[PDB]
Write a protein that binds this ligand. Structure first.
Ligand code: CLA
Ligand code: CLA
Ligand code: CLA
Ligand code: CLA
Ligand code: CLA
Ligand code: CLA
Ligand SMILES: CCCCCCCCCCCCCCCC(=O)OC[C@H](COP(=O)(O)OC[C@@H](O)CO)OC(=O)CCCCCCCCCCCCCCC
Ligand SMILES: CCCCCCCCCCCCCCCC(=O)OC[C@H](COP(=O)(O)OC[C@@H](O)CO)OC(=O)CCCCCCCCCCCCCCC
Ligand SMILES: CC1=C(/C=C/C(C)=C\C=C\C(C)=C\C=C\C=C(C)\C=C\C=C(C)\C=C\C2=C(C)C(=O)CCC2(C)C)C(C)(C)CCC1
Ligand SMILES: CC1=C(/C=C/C(C)=C\C=C\C(C)=C\C=C\C=C(C)\C=C/C=C(C)/C=C/C2=C(C)CCCC2(C)C)C(C)(C)CCC1
Ligand SMILES: CC1=C(/C=C/C(C)=C\C=C\C(C)=C\C=C\C=C(C)\C=C\C=C(C)\C=C\C2=C(C)CCCC2(C)C)C(C)(C)CCC1
Ligand code: SF4
Ligand code: SF4
Ligand SMILES: [Ca+2]
Ligand SMILES: [Ca+2]
Ligand SMILES: [Cl-]
Lengths: 38, 731, 80, 148, 31, 140, 157
């Protein structure tokens, strides 16, 4: 994996963020919201 | 007690099972059933939702533009469009190995990349965009456009700017502003863009934001438009030797009408396109002055509809203004039917009469475009009929529409359904019989007894447009005909493009095209029969004379009265989806096989083997798969690895849909009960307990999920086959 | 829960009560048919929705109708 | 899956010819080891490859196998209609057709009823099994009769 | 040319604006 | 009050009560038997009812009602004196079946009429006439 | 009275409390964001809150000395940053614990568990462990940056 296009360091950390951090956060928030009050 | 989600349905919020989750996702957009919904709040929420959707479309377009600019080879693609393949964007996947990296460093890229297949490169080029910075500024501006529409949607939900119900129900003014302003002014602005930018850039004249005020697109200004001598603008059109992007063969014309195809790019002339847009702009602005608003002068839709009474019909179209204006499912069904028809129309007109430069040579992109838009049209048609049935279930008023066209359509629904049944049985019986006869005839080593029947009517129609291959000499195929000697500037180019067997305009048809058009007729007739029978019985039948009391979508009515599985109109939609997918499969199979033959010059294969179905089984499906299924093998990986993997992915998803479709709930609820027993009695896991009681998917949910997997698999596997075959063969 | 309605086309043959597996229905006195009785749905919170009462109904189209509503532990038939 | 395994393994690592050297040349050249480990291998080097005998069987004594191949495919697709739908839609369609026959007084005394739910299931599974098994019957017979 | 390094990480700040406005529109439509 | 009766002779099974009986609710069937008999368990397998009073706890009401139908339809001296109650985790007991000491199959005085529509089936109001309300044709 | 377009209202409906409800001080986003930080997230015991806060803080406290401390231009740049971060987290733990020792001598309240002697000591313990671990794990990432890069680029496939 590499990239002659500019700012090739951006996908480096942006692919894990879109694939791991963002989904985990959204799924956790939606899970807490689904199971709220009781 | 209450579990909060979903806030819009206490009947769901008090569900202590996992269904509460699923249904919460399934009924969120059905605003009409939200607790305490009012019509005015319904309309206002729909308005804001529309704003959000427009912002989403603008963001997706900005993504296309930005990724093409950033990770594409647009400027390199312009240097040699016929050889350089356009790239959509770069790949960045840590799962990749050396083989995959080497395979996907393609089209002269220094890194793994996917090649574009949507013809957006040809679009942007024919439009006049020539650098990366232009695409970039376009993406940023579209970001701003999405921002504007998002703020508008936020503002229209505030008590200080909430449009009222009477404003939403103003049909006359809305039709005026859409016909005249939304449609007409926009085609006017697109004509102006083509005149100022697209055509000058096609001739090598750079027109940007830094010079468009200084350089007029015509040697004469607006006085020839002001005075009336409009032929000045036809001047010297682009010669038949104009090379695109240069000044060779270039002229000064900004509005022509020579018809035919550009000899190099093989697309419509940009001058004729801008001329078309100008004429259509004038027509739409004229249309947008029909209905009165606040100046007394004009028409009212209600009086026009009321006036159209009659003898045999009865009430005619009386009160239909209120009928359509008070039901949003009626408006949505009308819109969906119209938009699906015209989306199929776009699909039929883009492969035959292309309008983007050099896109006729890019065969994969054209195949993918035709397939995509025909699938969109099929979805839109199914949705239109679903919303018609939903209108019948929720909004239909029998007293305000008594004896009118609607009530009569319902009053003889048995005749309509039975005659659709007859035409469908007719078509299917005889087309399948002819195909099986041809198969059995070719099989026994006697291919001479095939029933080949010439598509005479459609060949005659082609000839009426100037097609002289079949020797019909009728209308525009006959030079001695009145219609052919009128002095229309579009006749020479049209005849030259329709009588040169080198493009995709009015393709020569044999008996196989006849058979497959009858198959298409069967598909349409049967899908429409499903949808119409569902919409007309949606209010009731002889099994459920009160089916309207249960709603548009319900599981059933039980095993009693003989059994009532798939009774609701929603079940008719779900049934019709299968036949719609089959109809689009027949469409795309026909299109792709005939076009592969056309592109390879070996039309003999399709013309001689499309008559028996084994021809389709071995010469189309089996053959064109050979490349795809070798995208990866025991020997390595080529550029079709993703397409082969996605082919198998679609197969898997399709079969998984079969899973939900064949096996029905109760078995699964019992199985889940045993698994619940297991969990409650296994130590350590007893530390943990579910918040929602696990339950099997519901009946309607199971139909929806099986159909969702079926459709996902259908689309993905056929897209993989289309792309891989047409790209490994290069047409 | 589910709604179980009874209409005036009731003939009072008591078959739907006999067919009910969760004791949702009762036979109350009436004066609209020969049997001088009509069906009722007092214990609807125990209705699961198996449509047996409709299956055992003789009138030309049922006089007793079951409409599936908000699901709960009792309506979903859960033993857990 | 059992019979597909049997066919491919026999043709790959067992069945074949033997030249006067002790050396054995198998039918499909031992491709089981490197190809039967992925699903793409079963799709390409087993189904796509070995169905070439069945599809090109027209014009020979095995054209009947291609005919029955297509016939089993058709019967599977036909079963799908009984497997994916419900009785109520068909009973409503039959009601409309019964009205149409009432229009011309061709109404049969034996009232047409849609297949019962259980019967719909039985018909669907019967046609499914028939179509699939006949498909693989034609495929296996043509293949194993066109390998010498 | 090729897009500037500084240019790619300039569109993201502009994208922060439709992100904020979509967040606002979602939260308002939830009401 | 306090439910009385001897538990049926049963060796145990995996189909009986779960966590719901103690977290949510449970049900009870009592019945008198003319002799030690063998009956089928709604949760699977055979059990032996004692002569005299029998008390049995079940997870769902339909299970108790299935046992009642079996008692009243499958034995030579028909057992029809069975009673079905609902027990809550607080120990509260709610008598259920038969509601008024008489089976609901046969008419009995004192019973009100609920869910009874004065109109016909085909006389329900059209949905469009009640739209944007929280009601359905069978509710107004 | 069709005039409440104002976004800055009285804080918590009390105009005489020294605060103003503003899009930063009391908006839905800031409220749901700060309120769900480990310091305020409901359903969290003090030691878990301290663990999370320490993880974050010790992780980011590696950088300053790593890139700017005196060992930045030595062969022990990452080790020097790590040592500085560990000493800083130790001093901060001492400060946290001293604060807890002095503020909770009297009667233990019943509001929230964090605002007690036991709760604050648990928070300090969690902070110490989380901070030492976060500093060591950011150090370990920096020292093994090549394997991280090879992983995120698929170089080892
Ligand atoms: C819907 C539009 C769209 C789509 C489908 C994609 C697609 C993709 N992008 Mg891109 N991107 C877009 C717009 C889009 N982009 C815009 C407008 C910008 C400039 C602000 C960028 C800048 C960007 C960068 C810097 C990178 C990508 C990258 C990627 C790839 C991985 C996603 C990622 O990691 O970045 C996440 C994307 C962003 C942080 C930008 C936000 C996207 C827009 C502004 C919002 C889209 C909202 C839209 C409604 C979708 C919502 C979901 C939907 C269900 C409602 C992926 C194929 C990576 C890549 O190059 O792959 C190799 C990467 O390095 N994008
Ligand atoms: C001239 C004034 C005007 C204009 C500019 C608009 C504009 C618009 N209104 Mg509005 N409105 C107005 C006045 C106006 N309105 C009035 C007077 C009323 C009544 C009082 C309304 C009430 C109203 C309501 C209630 C709604 C709208 C909606 C809309 C939007 C329609 C949906 C859409 O975005 O698709 C755009 C459609 C087109 C551009 C037309 C395309 C032509 C067809 C599809 C064929 C395509 C041709 C061509 C080949 C396509 C190019 C392909 C390309 C890829 C190459 C649109 C932008 C809807 C909305 O979205 O809310 C925001 C909506 O719900 N209007
Ligand atoms: C063109 C725009 C459009 C609009 C705005 C609507 C509007 C609506 N539709 Mg409709 N429909 C459309 C197109 C559209 N439809 C199309 C193209 C089809 C053919 C597939 C249908 C077929 C259809 C059916 C059968 C039903 C609706 C339903 C609904 C309502 C609820 C939507 C929902 O929450 O489902 C939730 C959406 C999802 C769970 C998405 C899952 C699928 C992903 C994309 C995969 C809603 C008011 C439902 C309804 O309320 O009936 C009254 C319903 O039953 N629509
Ligand atoms: C190859 C698969 C297949 C076949 C053959 C059929 C067949 C048929 N479907 Mg169907 N459908 C299918 C798939 C299929 N479907 C699937 C997967 C679904 C989704 C569940 C549907 C859902 C569906 C719906 C909702 C409807 C139909 C309808 C119809 C009938 C319309 C008449 C027609 O099309 O022309 C003529 C018939 C044919 C081409 C097939 C029969 C031809 C045979 C070979 C004739 C020979 C009979 C044979 C000799 C009998 C003796 C056999 C003996 C050896 C035992 C027809 C009989 C529509 C209908 O009923 O129209 C009134 C209808 O509304 N289908
Ligand atoms: C003068 C002040 C100052 C200084 C000099 C530094 C200096 C530094 N910081 Mg710091 N920082 C500061 C203040 C400062 N920071 C402040 C005030 C904050 C906010 C509180 C931060 C927060 C911050 C974070 C969050 C990070 C840094 C990091 C770094 C280092 C990045 C340079 C590098 O080595 O490349 C290399 C950079 C990387 C390899 C990035 C790490 C990528 C990992 C794998 C994350 C992947 C994302 C994804 C979600 C994976 C999660 C997996 C999960 C799902 C299991 C560097 C030495 C990074 C670091 O410590 O390096 C490890 C880093 O992660 N800083
Ligand atoms: C009066 C005594 C004194 C001493 C001896 C030092 C000495 C030092 N100073 Mg400091 N300084 C002081 C006062 C002092 N200073 C004052 C009063 C100020 C305010 C003006 C400053 C402001 C100043 C700044 C701004 C900085 C220094 C820095 C440094 C260090 C530079 C080298 C290094 O890499 O550190 C690394 C060593 C440590 C951080 C201490 C760790 C020592 C051990 C190994 C800790 C391990 C914990 C261990 C488990 C404890 C066990 C306890 C047990 C024995 C009971 C150095 C050790 C720089 C620095 O911190 O370098 C990173 C720096 O940035 N000084
Ligand atoms: C080409 C399609 C291939 C086959 C599809 C099926 C065709 C259906 C024909 C069956 C006979 C219809 C029986 C009519 C029953 C009938 O006669 O109703 C009675 C009706 C009398 O109408 P009135 O005089 O009251 O008209 C006043 C109106 O304003 C109120 O309706 O007759 C007509 O409307 C005129 C001719 C019927 C027109 C029927 C339209 C059928 C569609 C045909 C294709 C439309 C193409 C439109 C393109 C612009
Ligand atoms: C510029 C955009 C601004 C958004 C912030 C962006 C990054 C910052 C993330 C911080 C989030 C804060 C977390 C605490 C927030 C938090 O925990 O709130 C609290 C709440 C549960 O906690 P409680 O109700 O107990 O807390 C209430 C009080 O304590 C509030 O302080 O969680 C939720 O409300 C559910 C979350 C909403 C679910 C949103 C649905 C998202 C799904 C759709 C996503 C669409 C993506 C499309 C594009 C791909
Ligand atoms: C003073 C004034 C006049 C002078 C006006 C002048 C002096 C200039 C007028 C300029 C106009 C009216 C410009 C209209 C511009 C619209 C533009 C530029 C673009 C719209 C693009 C959209 C909506 C989306 C585009 C997309 C993007 C961005 C892409 O990059 C790919 C294609 C696509 C996806 C379509 C005259 C005398 C005349 C009349 C009297 C008043
Ligand atoms: C159910 C329902 C619904 C729906 C419906 C639908 C869905 C329908 C359909 C459909 C369709 C979708 C149709 C279409 C059609 C067609 C037409 C209308 C035709 C046209 C024609 C013409 C006349 C042409 C002509 C021409 C030619 C031939 C060629 C050349 C050119 C010209 C122009 C000359 C609604 C909601 C509404 C209401 C309720 C119920
Ligand atoms: C989000 C956001 C933001 C931002 C922020 C920032 C700028 C930052 C942060 C960042 C950070 C701050 C991060 C972090 C990280 C951390 C980590 C990752 C950790 C860790 C740890 C671990 C992993 C462990 C360890 C250990 C232990 C403890 C045990 C033993 C030893 C060891 C070492 C193993 C803001 C607010 C603006 C806005 C909104 C959104
Ligand atoms: S089965 Fe029908 S007719 Fe008989 S008592 Fe019950 S509701 Fe009345
Ligand atoms: S649906 Fe079942 S439980 Fe409900 S009243 Fe009818 S028979 Fe009784
Ligand atoms: Ca330019
Ligand atoms: Ca130093
Ligand atoms: Cl493989």
């Amino acid at each position: 994996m590499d990239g002659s296009y500019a700012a090739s360091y951006l996908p480096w950390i942006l692919i894990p963020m879109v694939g791991w951090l963002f989904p985990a956060v959204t799924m956790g928030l939606l899970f807490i919201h689904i199971e709220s009050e009781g | 007690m209450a579990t909060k989600f979903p806030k819009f349905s206490q009947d769901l919020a008090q569900d202590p099972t996992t269904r509460r989750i699923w249904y919460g996702i399934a009924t969120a957009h059905d605003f009409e059933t939200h607790d305490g919904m009012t019509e005015e709040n319904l309309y206002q929420k729909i308005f804001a939702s529309h704003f959000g959707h427009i912002a989403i479309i603008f963001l997706w377009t900005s993504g296309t533009l930005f990724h093409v600019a950033w990770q594409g080879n647009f400027e390199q693609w312009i240097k040699d469009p016929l050889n350089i393949r356009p790239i959509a964007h770069a790949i960045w996947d840590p799962h990749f190995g050396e083989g995959a990296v080497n395979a996907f460093t393609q089209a002269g890229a220094s890194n793994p990349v996917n090649i574009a297949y949507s013809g957006v490169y040809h679009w942007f080029y024919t439009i006049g965009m020539t650098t990366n910075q232009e695409l970039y500024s376009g993406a940023v501006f579209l970001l701003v456009l999405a921002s504007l529409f998002l703020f508008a949607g936020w503002l229209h939900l505030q008590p200080k700017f909430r449009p009222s119900l009477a404003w939403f129900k103003n049909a006359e003014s809305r039709l005026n502003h859409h016909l005249a302003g939304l449609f007409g002014v926009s085609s006017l602005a697109w004509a102006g863009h083509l005149v100022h930018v697209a055509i000058p850039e096609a001739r090598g004249q750079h027109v940007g934001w830094d010079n468009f005020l200084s350089t007029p697109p015509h040697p004469a200004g607006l006085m020839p438009f002001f005075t009336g001598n409009w032929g000045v603008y036809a001047a010297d059109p682009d010669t038949a030797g104009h090379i695109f992007g240069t000044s060779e063969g270039a002229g000064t014309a900004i509005l022509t009408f020579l018809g035919g195809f550009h000899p190099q790019t093989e697309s419509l002339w940009l001058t004729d396109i801008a001329h078309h847009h100008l004429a259509i702009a004038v027509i739409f602005i004229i249309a947008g002055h029909m209905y009165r608003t606040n100046w007394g002068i004009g028409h009212s839709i209600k009086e026009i509809l009321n006036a159209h009474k009659g003898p045999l019909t009865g009430a005619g179209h009386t009160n239909l203004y209120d009928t359509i204006n008070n039901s949003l499912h009626f408006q949505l069904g009308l819109a969906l039917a119209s938009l699906g028809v015209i989306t199929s129309l776009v699909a039929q007109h883009m492969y035959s009469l292309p309008s983007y430069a050099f896109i006729a040579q890019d065969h994969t992109t054209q195949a993918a475009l035709y397939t995509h838009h025909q699938y969109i049209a099929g979805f839109l048609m199914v949705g239109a009929f679903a919303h018609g049935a939903i209108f019948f279930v929720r909004d239909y008023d029998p007293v305000a529409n008594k004896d009118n066209v609607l009530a009569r359509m319902l009053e003889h629904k048995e005749a309509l359904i039975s005659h659709l049944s007859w035409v469908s049985l007719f078509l299917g019986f005889h087309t399948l019989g002819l195909y099986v006869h041809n198969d059995v005839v070719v099989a026994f080593g006697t291919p001479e007894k095939q029933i080949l029947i010439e598509p005479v009517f459609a060949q005659w129609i082609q000839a009426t447009s100037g097609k002289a291959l079949y020797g019909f000499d009728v209308l525009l195929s006959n030079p001695d005909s009145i219609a052919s000697t009128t002095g229309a500037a579009w006749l020479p180019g049209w005849l030259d493009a329709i009588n040169s067997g080198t493009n995709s305009l009015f393709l020569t048809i044999g008996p196989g095209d006849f058979l497959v058009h009858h198959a298409i007729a069967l598909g349409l007739h049967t899908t429409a029969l499903i949808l119409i029978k569902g919409a007309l019985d949606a209010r009731g039948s002889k099994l459920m004379p009160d089916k309207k009391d249960f709603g548009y979508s319900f599981p059933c009515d039980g095993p009693g009265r003989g059994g009532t599985c798939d009774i609701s109109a929603w079940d008719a939609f779900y049934l019709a989806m299968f036949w719609m997918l089959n109809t689009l499969g027949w469409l795309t199979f026909y299109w792709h096989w005939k076009h592969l033959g056309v592109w390879s010059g070996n039309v003999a294969q399709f013309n001689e083997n499309s008559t028996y179905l084994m021809g389709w089984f071995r010469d189309y499906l089996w053959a064109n798969s050979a490349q795809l299924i070798n995208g990866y093998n025991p020997y390595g990986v080529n550029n079709l690895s993703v397409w082969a993997w996605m082919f198998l992915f679609g197969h898997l998803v399709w079969a998984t849909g079969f899973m939900f479709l064949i096996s029905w709930r109760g078995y699964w609820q019992e199985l889940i009960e045993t698994i619940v027993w297991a969990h409650e009695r296994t130590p350590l896991a007893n530390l943990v307990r579910w918040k929602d009681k696990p339950v099997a998917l519901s009946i309607v949910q199971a139909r929806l999920v099986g159909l969702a997997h079926f459709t996902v698999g259908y689309v993905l596997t056929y897209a993989a086959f289309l792309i891989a075959s047409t790209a490994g063969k290069f047409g | 829960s589910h709604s179980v309605k009874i209409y005036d086309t009731c003939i009072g043959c008591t078959q739907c009560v006999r067919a009910c597996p969760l004791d949702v229905l009762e036979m109350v006195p009436w004066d609209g048919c020969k049997a001088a009785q009509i069906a009722s749905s007092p214990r609807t919170e125990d209705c699961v929705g198996c449509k047996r009462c409709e299956t055992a109904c003789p009138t030309d189209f049922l006089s007793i109708r079951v409409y599936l509503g908000a699901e709960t532990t009792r309506s979903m038939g859960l033993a857990y | 899956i059992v019979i597909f395994h049997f066919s491919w393994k026999m043709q790959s690592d067992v069945w074949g010819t033997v030249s006067p050297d002790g050396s054995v040349t198998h039918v499909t050249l031992g491709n089981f080891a490197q190809s039967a480990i992925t699903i793409n291998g079963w799709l390409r080097d087993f189904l796509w490859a070995q169905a070439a005998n069945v599809i090109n069987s027209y014009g020979s004594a095995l054209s009947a196998y291609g005919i029955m191949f297509l016939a089993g495919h058709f019967v599977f697709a036909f079963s799908l209609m009984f497997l994916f739908s419900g009785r109520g839609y068909w009973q409503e369609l039959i009601e409309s057709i019964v009205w149409a026959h009432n229009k011309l007084n061709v109404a049969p005394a034996i009232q047409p009823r849609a297949l019962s739910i259980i019967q719909g299931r039985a018909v669907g599974v019967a046609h499914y099994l028939l179509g699939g098994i006949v498909t693989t019957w034609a495929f296996f017979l043509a293949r194993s009769l066109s390998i010498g | 040319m090729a897009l500037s390094d500084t240019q790619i990480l300039a569109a993201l700040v502009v994208a922060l604006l439709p992100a904020f406005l979509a967040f606002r529109l979602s939260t308002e439509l939830y009401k | 009050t306090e439910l009385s009766g001897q538990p049926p002779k049963f060796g145990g099974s995996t189909g009986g009560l779960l966590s719901k009986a103690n977290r949510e609710e449970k049900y009870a069937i009592t019945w008198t038997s003319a002799s030690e008999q063998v009956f089928e368990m709604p949760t699977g397998g055979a059990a032996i009812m004692n002569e005299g009073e029998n008390l049995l706890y079940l997870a769902r009401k339909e299970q108790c009602l299935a046992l009642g139908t079996q008692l009243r339809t499958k034995f030579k001296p028909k057992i029809q004196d069975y009673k079905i109650y609902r027990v809550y985790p607080s120990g509260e007991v709610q008598y259920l079946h038969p509601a008024d000491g008489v089976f609901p199959e046969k008419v009995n005085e004192g019973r009100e009429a609920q869910g009874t529509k004065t109109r016909r089936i085909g006389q329900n109001p059209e949905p469009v006439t009640i739209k944007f309300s929280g009601k359905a044709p069978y509710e107004v | 009275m069709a005039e409440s377009n104002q976004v800055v209202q009285a804080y918590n409906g009390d105009p005489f409390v020294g605060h103003l409800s503003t899009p930063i001080s009391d908006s839905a986003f800031t409220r749901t964001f700060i309120g769900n930080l480990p310091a305020y997230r409901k359903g969290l015991s003090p030691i878990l809150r301290g663990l999370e806060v320490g993880m974050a803080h010790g992780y980011f406290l590696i950088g300053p000395w790593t890139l700017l401390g005196p060992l930045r231009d030595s062969e022990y740049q990452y080790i020097g940053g790590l040592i500085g971060a560990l000493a800083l987290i130790l001093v901060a733990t001492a400060a946290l614990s001293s604060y807890g020792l002095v503020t909770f001598q009297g009667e233990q309240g019943s509001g929230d568990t964090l605002q007690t002697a036991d709760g604050w000591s648990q928070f300090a313990a969690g902070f110490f462990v989380g901070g030492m671990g976060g500093a060591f794990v950011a150090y370990f990432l920096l020292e093994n940056l090549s394997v991280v890069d090879g992983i995120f680029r698929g170089l080892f496939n």
